[PDB]
Design a protein around this ligand. Structure first.
Ligand code: GDP
Ligand code: CO
Length: 169
């Protein structure tokens, strides 16, 4: 019966890799508050309590701006965790993800916990990004890495749980 720590966590990745779907699937299976948004609904926020911990995430998600632009300094500000998502059936989304990571590390504090999500791992029959290639990049850059499926829920909870485990207290 002690102190809840709150951490801002931001979603990053090309349009259409499933960032929003991941947030929603995760949220669906945890205690959470009603979704909110910022002015003009430029960014969508949702608060969620991770089961059997005293970790509360304030998860930030975009409203699609990724397909046109970089993301604003406001989006990054305060983030203590990130999930950078790519689509395992799209090499391009993987190459791009590497750049979201660099952009992230440059904009965020040195102790941010970054997880790399190889999403749509349920389309294994259309895999275009090899697991060990992502894992090697992830290891070389101190990133947590898992393959996920927002659709089937595979590893959705556990990538959030993995992050929580690396966060302070
Ligand atoms: N098969 C499959 N489709 C997914 C998965 N995650 C997202 N999608 C689909 O990919 C499309 C784009 O998803 P969205 O969450 O909007 O991606 P975002 O633009 O990066 O937030 C939608 O049609 C989703 O239902 C997944 O894990 N598996
Ligand atoms: Co989205």
């Amino acid at each position: 019966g002690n102190k809840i720590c709150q951490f801002k966590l931001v979603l990053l990745g090309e349009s259409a890799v499933g960032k929003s779907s991941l947030v929603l699937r995760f949220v669906k299976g945890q205690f959470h508050e009603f979704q909110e948004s910022t002015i003009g609904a430029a960014f969508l926020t949702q608060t969620v309590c991770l089961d059997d911990t005293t970790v509360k995430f304030e998860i930030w998600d975009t409203a699609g701006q990724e397909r046109y632009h970089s993301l604003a300094p406001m989006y990054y500000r305060g983030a203590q965790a990130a999930i950078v998502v790519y689509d395992i059936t799209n090499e391009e989304s993987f190459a791009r993800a590497k750049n979201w990571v660099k952009e992230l590390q440059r904009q965020a504090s040195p102790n941010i916990v970054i997880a790399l999500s190889g999403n749509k791992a349920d389309l294994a029959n259309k895999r275009a990004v090899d697991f060990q290639e992502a894992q090697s990049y992830a290891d070389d850059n101190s990133l947590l890495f898992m393959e996920t499926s927002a659709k089937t829920s595979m590893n959705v909870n556990e990538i959030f749980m993995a992050i929580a485990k690396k966060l302070p207290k």
